[PDB]
């Protein structure tokens, strides 16, 4: 082993000097403490055989002139089935107190993106098995989805179902990257994951706010490496959740500040674009498989022009906006059908039938949201005669988007419901045409296919 | 008198509907003007702080 | 002689020695990575790494090549995918080249150029209609995120099939998903034959993104000097600038407006100056540039957008308002301009399409106060109908450019008022079927293409053929 | 004589070490680069017999320890009548071919500005032809004129019209100075100059975008040095046109960083005021001769508080501001009638009617601008009957300021109409008094005379 | 650790940050947005996280945190407010418009949130 | 705010007994003489001590002048034990003087270009201005607000 | 000093400041807000304070000062304009909203104040 010695320490950053050989950039180092060994990551070479590093844990205890062991490789993490249903550190260590990992393969966190010829050049539509998404906000294989949410609007429920639907629906496995995760909401996630029984059908990778900026930066890649394995080695589709991507972005600037780089526009790191790209270019659809990704995005000062979400929006393929208004009304999942948008919603991608349905659905939903001013104060009676027939459709359409969820079984009691695209199209296509005009709106609430919607009306 | 007051309120519906629409679009432009300055104000702040430290 | 790395980090390196090294000389680091000698200080040499800086570290040897940073340019490149350095990306074997050309090269003087004559046709009815482009012109494609910016760029490359024009689509700070799908589409349609693709994607290091557009135009110079016509497309510059910003701030160069350095204007000004049409003395070649720029919420009065607008020969605005309303390509005629004008445009084209530009601008102002006057003038009502119809004609789909002959007739229909009785709904198909009627039967399309003007006879000849189709339609 | 060696290079700046004698500041150095020689300009004396020099051309190729020779004098240029009708370099070289110059006299670039008492006080206007300018902000003979405009609001177009109105059909000498603008415009102008035949009397200097910083910096001077020669040596009234003077001040910031100066506001050079004064005060009408300078000023990001446009304001007798709001509204020339002002607009100079009318339209337009906030959210119907008439008149006056340009004839497709000062004041008076209240507002755009405005109103009726 | 339930109140973290800023800037540590060091988020995260409820196995005690933060003219997007909001489990937004109007305590329900929610309430409530 | 202090003195310090202390910290010297004129005619001058260090004075003066006027008042509450009224105008200028010099003392500038030890420098001086068990002082200190901006650190 | 009345005028201090900025940043005295050095207040403080009226004991000779300041789009929050306002014994505000409106000289009574008041006025006035 190549060994060195510490020269100086300033909070997070640590400078280290070697005699014989000097470690390459992004190489993992190790210093021995009685408590636990501390992992550092070399960033740059200064001179006089000295290199500057960022710590993945606290440095309260380190002396100058300590022994440090060069691993000679960028921090490597275990991959494969050993990771499934385990809570992973940024360094690939277990923190769920479920014994040791017995992984038979190890891939480094830092690696270059898939090359040109490797990428699959075809817009393959991805179905989640949910009506509102697959129709109005269609996902793409190897895509990046914006999850505009937060707070009690049934976000973690939506995620747990999306994981369950790909696992059951297709031959797929999910990954979750808790970038700047709350230690409280970490336990409660792992809790509800085992409760719903989805724990096995996903990988968990937490990098808490508790940990230093170096940790929060690289934890995003840890989970991405685990997902990289399932696409590269095994020939299957993957679903990589990130929450929150801004906490990755902000970790970057925090690091850039500590290293003492000149801050760019708005005080973010100068390498905002590349550091963002390095992650997002890795998430794509190969011929072998595909990593689709649902990323949550914070938007500072509710500003889209702000560089952090702006550079993020470059990579985003579709967006899914959870509304509290729809959540309060009692429609789950929420998913605002107007705010939510996608690249894939076009005749060239999905089809002529799918397109014109989604358009008409949105135009009617918009016309209802216009006449929402009148009905809220005045009433359904005090309104134009011609619009009331289109409003009566709109209210049923919005309530039809409600969906029984397999994960919710534990709470609601009702059994779940996966729904493919062709089943939804017909259902919505009939409603706007006006075949099921005689069917009450209460029948549409929390029902699967249009076949079951008409069935529930007689039941009532 | 019924026709006039019926017309009055129908006319007031029009004037206020456009007034609301004009306001809505005015708010948009101002919000962009605000964020334009927000961005500038943050950039400049840092420029002065970095410029002061680096000079030292 | 030679050198060794004594300090490195953030894509910047400090090198000891290199006695006889020159400014901007290509360097050779181990593991195949290379760089450009930047700061020739008294005791050391500065270098910008043109690749992954991880593979280089302190101690590693560095040998000066002896030549300035240069890109391998040739006629073999046609139909290949290239990186900033010039290496093959596609994976279709090595690249045999005639010339090695420099990426950084001062543009031509005043007398070295001449006024543009022949037009460059994008093949879109709106663009070639009322905002024409000339071979040697520099025209900006400005708009928000996803407004059909790249769509217009590729549709131009498509239409260059069978006009002896080379194409260079340089992808700066893009994603490979986009670049690869473009390579696939172009090769399927058979336009990749005569097209080069330079690529410095979002994954790749900032210096490669910085280098890419200069490499692109340097390969474009190869064909120009010989005496051919070239098309180059910078997609996009607002990413290119940020790439350069990253470098400058890591080089500790003082920041300016929006943290962009003082010479972010000179970055793009000297680049786009190299795109022009040379005089006949130097061989009548040309490099036509279509740079792209991405505005934040239509903020065209930002630092870079204004920089680029002030160096280009006009611009093409694309609003999300029009795009989302269902009007593509979402070109704003009222704002968009082309400084060259009718110098590089067909007579036939100028006869029909010249009237439109101003009418559209007025059309929109008439629409705004159409809300108020419940009743309106009946002469003005006719203009709205015309306006609705002419706009529907200007709307066309993607990956389907028109020939000039097909554009001429498309305008002639509506501007003369042979479509006034036809309903707005089925206006798009009415055009399609009419050109198909003229194609096989009357072969008036070929008459226009060769003649390139509408005279006394052919104008009435056209009016006869459409009158036949009018009756035939059901 | 005085030969040195290159110690270190940094992009556009080179540090040279002399053994014996050290060259004074602004001296021209020469290095034998591959094939062609490169010209450098010494700036600072560092120490250890070393000097920091800014290059006038690309430094790509320069090795460490190359030989370099001092000329002794500053950069001197061919000056006089020899230059007329030929485009010149930053160094003073001819780039038009057509043989070498017939240079008799020479003169250095860097020379002190005219001292106080050498200056002359003259306050006489001259009609440009343009209605908005001639009324509100009339230009002054032997004065410094300023054309402020954002990116693409028609400031270069305006110059091209002013040279077409003034310098075209007048006997006086002219000078043009291309500074960091389009090289396309260079060829476009040089062609339009020759074919028109103005080329003969006028002289051109160019250092455009393609040129490095050092070039764009000093070209502003060489052209001025040429213009100085004619007011001094010949003692003849000359016209100086610059586009764009901002690019000179811009170049400064690119260099200043390399010279190691501490940056000021918005990352500009800390000596912005003096560096500009040392040029702008040199562009002035003396006793010996008279220079009427009309220079364009680029406003970056439409931000006039920016220190480069901000400081230039205090070097001008008349200023014509171009607003994007006006251009976007579809009115050319896009001249803001309130923000644009001239020193000459006083009863002393322009008389009673000129002044009385000019201030009246300003008062009306000001009121229109005041009410423009309220109208935007509510409408025209709400404001009082007293305001209603002033607003309607304002909108007509505003649109009447528009007129077609001879340069933009190919663009607009209309005969550009030169309007004399006396017929403009007649028009804005009749409109103000309310004798053209019957005419629609859409009969004032791109007209010219008021006689033509009513002709357009009758043309409609048909 | 002795299985007791604790309440701790930081009044306030906005003053705390400024105290840490001083140290950093005098130690010549590189400044960031509003002259704060990179590890100002890290400073507050490792404090606030240290307040939580243990399992029954580890006593069953808890430490509840009521951090306070001062906003300038309702600036919640400022560097400390924005990031301290991001850390905490919920937020109680006060407004002077309510305070002056006579509302006490001047709490804004609309924007106030507790992600814990019903879990920390008795059936009756 | 200056006129307001002048009134508070006219109302309180003139009518009531006990001593007082005015501290002219980096404001107009004109106003100094204007006070001194009103003080002597009113007869308050005898029952008050005036410390001054106005705009015209350099940084160091404007900095430590507040401490001089404070130290006079400190004595009167502790040693003497009489009721004290401490008037200061303006306590911003103390901070301002700090910022001028701060740069040249090698301090990195903090938010909106102040000294990085703004809170502690002020806190050290302000905590010292207080009533105690041994005696009480009534501190009325005017505060400048740069450009009417209350978000400004000072 | 001789005991005569003077009226000095500075045209203008806003430019005067920029010169001092040039000096400082070249001398390597570090920058502050808007790149101006530390003592740009003290620059104008000691200059304007110099203007005064002396007592009858030293002649009674005056020296009235009228400094000028050039605002950027009516921005008085700027560093120098605000500096000078706080030094002087009042100010006179000119707005183009009046100047263009046809009110010359365009004085805004609202913001314009004189800290000497009627003390410097004839009884008739
Ligand atoms: N003329 C057109 N007709 C129909 N659809 C179009 C047209 N142009 C573009 N589109 C569609 O709009 C989408 C976005 O177009 P494009 O990517 O060219 O815009 P962009 O501004 O380059 O996007 P980005 O900024 O994300 O790179 C594409 O998916 C394309 O299918
Ligand atoms: N006087 C004018 N009349 C009509 N159009 C004009 C006029 N001036 C400018 N324009 C339009 O605006 C564009 C900008 O002109 P230009 O002088 O290049 O502006 P700038 O020099 O400020 O970039 C022109 O190409 C033209 O289309
Ligand atoms: N009580 C008052 N009554 C009337 N005017 C006042 C009063 N106090 C202040 N002013 C006005 O304000 C000016 C003095 O303000 P000043 O005390 O100098 O405030 P600051 O200390 O903030 O500069 C005077 O010119 C006067 O017109
Ligand atoms: Mg694109
Ligand atoms: Mg121009
Ligand atoms: Mg006061």
Numbering used by the authors:
A (entry chain E): 1 to 460
B (entry chain G): 227 to 282
C (entry chain B): 27 to 500
D (entry chain F): 1 to 462
E (entry chain A), G (entry chain C): 251 to 375
F (entry chain D): 155 to 308
Sentences from the paper on this structure:
The adenosine triphosphate (ATP) synthases, also known as F-ATPases or F1Fo-ATPases, are multi-subunit enzymes found in energy-transducing membranes in mitochondria, chloroplasts and eubacteria. They catalyse the synthesis of ATP from ADP and inorganic phosphate by using energy from a transmembrane electrochemical gradient of protons, known as the proton motive force (or pmf). The membrane extrinsic sector, known as F1-ATPase, is the catalytic part where ATP is formed from ADP and inorganic phosphate. Three α-subunits and three β-subunits are arranged in alternation around a central stalk made from single copies of the γ- and ɛ-subunits, and in the intact ATP synthase, the central stalk is associated with a ring of c-subunits in the membrane domain of the complex.
As part of this endeavour to develop bacterial ATP synthases as drug targets for treating infectious diseases, we have studied the structure and regulation of the F1-catalytic domain of the ATP synthase from the opportunistic periodontal pathogen Fusobacterium nucleatum, which is associated with a wide range of diseases including oral infections, adverse pregnancy outcomes, gastrointestinal disorders and atherosclerosis. Crystals of the F1-ATPase complex from F. nucleatum have the unit cell parameters a = 111.9 Å, b = 200.2 Å, c = 201.7 Å, β = 102.2° and belong to the space group P21 with two F1-complexes in the asymmetric unit (referred to as molecules 1 and 2, respectively). The structure was solved to 3.6 Å resolution by molecular replacement with the α3β3-subcomplex, with no ligands or water molecules, taken from the structure of the F1-ATPase from Caldalkalibacillus thermarum containing the mutations Asp99Ala and Arg92Ala in the ɛ-subunit. Each of the final models of the two complexes contains three α-subunits (αE, αTP and αDP), three β-subunits (βE, βTP and βDP), and single copies of the γ- and ɛ-subunits, and a total of 6420 amino acid residues were resolved. The nucleotide-binding sites in the three α-subunits have additional electron density that is compatible with each of them being occupied by an ATP molecule and an accompanying magnesium ion. Similarly, additional density in the nucleotide-binding sites of the βTP- and βDP-subunits provides strong evidence for the presence in each site of an ADP molecule with a magnesium ion. There is no evidence for the binding of either a magnesium ion or phosphate in the βE-subunit of F1-ATPase in F. nucleatum. The N-terminal domain of the ɛ-subunit is folded into a 10-stranded β-sandwich, and the C-terminal domain consists of a hairpin of two α-helices, lying alongside the β-sandwich. This conformation of two α-helices is known as the ‘down’ position. In F. nucleatum, the ɛ-subunit is ‘down’ with no bound ATP, but, in contrast to the F1-ATPases from C. thermarum and M. smegmatis, it is intrinsically active in ATP hydrolysis, and that activity can be stimulated by LDAO.
